[PDB]
Symmetry: C2
Subunit: 214 residues, 2 copies
């Protein structure tokens, strides 16, 4: 059984502001930076197998604190980026509710709806899920012979983790909105179970932890 940990980046300025980030390369705040250190303490004790991070700085800076703690290099992948929010990026909840009222609240309940020029949850999962399959195929150590509980740690963003977790869990798309939003420097854990020798689509994923804090 393979353990997969996903960690949301620490607080940014936009978070405090309720301003849609998407794929804008915003910076960690000081509190956010200290949050990543606290999180690296807890996740570090689990002895990760490897760290893969979003290339956006707020996730990358968070991941690096874990890498320091563990002595592990941080690999980078654009497929771990937050939902692209299109024309909404850089606008706040207040501003969005003015132009197209109800649109934002409708968005959280429909994993297929995308802001104009952005991605839906379904889009983000199509983009990130193969990364997990690659890692399944590339790391025989993972859930394997020697130390089968050492996790793979993805450092990313709230939307991505919800979209990717729902997809790995093979939840119907109608139920993806059931997963509430993760906190800053909080993590989620799925465990991958396969009948010995089986394919990637034959792996059954179970939700171990959703949104634990440090």
């Amino acid at each position: 059984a393979r353990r997969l940990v996903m960690l949301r980046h620490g607080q940014t300025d936009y978070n405090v502001g309720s301003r849609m980030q998407g794929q804008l390369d915003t910076e960690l705040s000081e509190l956010g930076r200290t949050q990543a250190v606290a999180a690296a303490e807890v996740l570090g004790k689990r002895q990760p197998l490897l760290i893969v991070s979003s290339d956006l700085r707020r996730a990358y800076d968070t991941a690096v604190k874990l890498g320091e703690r563990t002595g592990l290099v941080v690999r980078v992948d654009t497929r771990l980026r937050e939902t692209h929010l299109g024309d909404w990026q850089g606008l706040t909840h207040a501003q969005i509710d003015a132009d197209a009222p109800g649109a934002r609240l409708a968005w959280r309940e429909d994993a297929t709806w995308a802001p104009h020029g952005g991605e839906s949850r379904v889009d983000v999962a199509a983009r990130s899920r193969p990364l997990v399959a690659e890692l399944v195929a590339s790391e025989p150590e993972w859930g394997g012979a020697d130390e089968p509980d050492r996790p793979v740690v993805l450092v990313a963003h709230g939307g991505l983790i919800a979209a990717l977790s729902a997809a790995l869990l093979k939840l119907p798309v109608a139920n993806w909105p059931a997963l509430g939003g993760m906190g800053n420097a909080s993590w989620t854990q799925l465990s991958g179970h396969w009948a010995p020798g089986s394919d990637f689509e034959s792996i059954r994923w179970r939700l171990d932890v959703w949104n634990a804090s440090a």
Copy 2:
């Protein structure tokens, strides 16, 4: 929104044995007693509005430690008991897999299936969910005007919390196996957003520790 927190009891003098408990009234271990004291510190700071506990001692003992920290009377409800596991109660995984190879692993994947004389996951949800419906209609302070964040704390068991959460989340029954098992002195939090079937529940936290 209404915050609903479900807390699993601390370690017992039994879990380590890989022995199905079900509704066996097993006791906390010494760690369990200290874990319940630990959890009450964390959940106590959130100041619950009320505490409802299973009558199984391992949950009841845990709840009382939260109740002491908070000054709350602990309500008791048999509807919060763990899944009754029928002929499996008290047997080890080794014995069950010897009697019925595959049945145990097949069981964790089918929320409708019950060991002979037991309950299914669906059974546990049907008996426990009306307690949630009662509370929503019974406590207007919950998510109310002055202090809308005061949570309701159900102190129960891993099987029940998985089944009840999945039911409140209105997941298809085929998808209930996605919610894995909670650890000793772990908690789960759903929030209720806008009748009672018209309430939409969101998973805020699943299986956080202390």
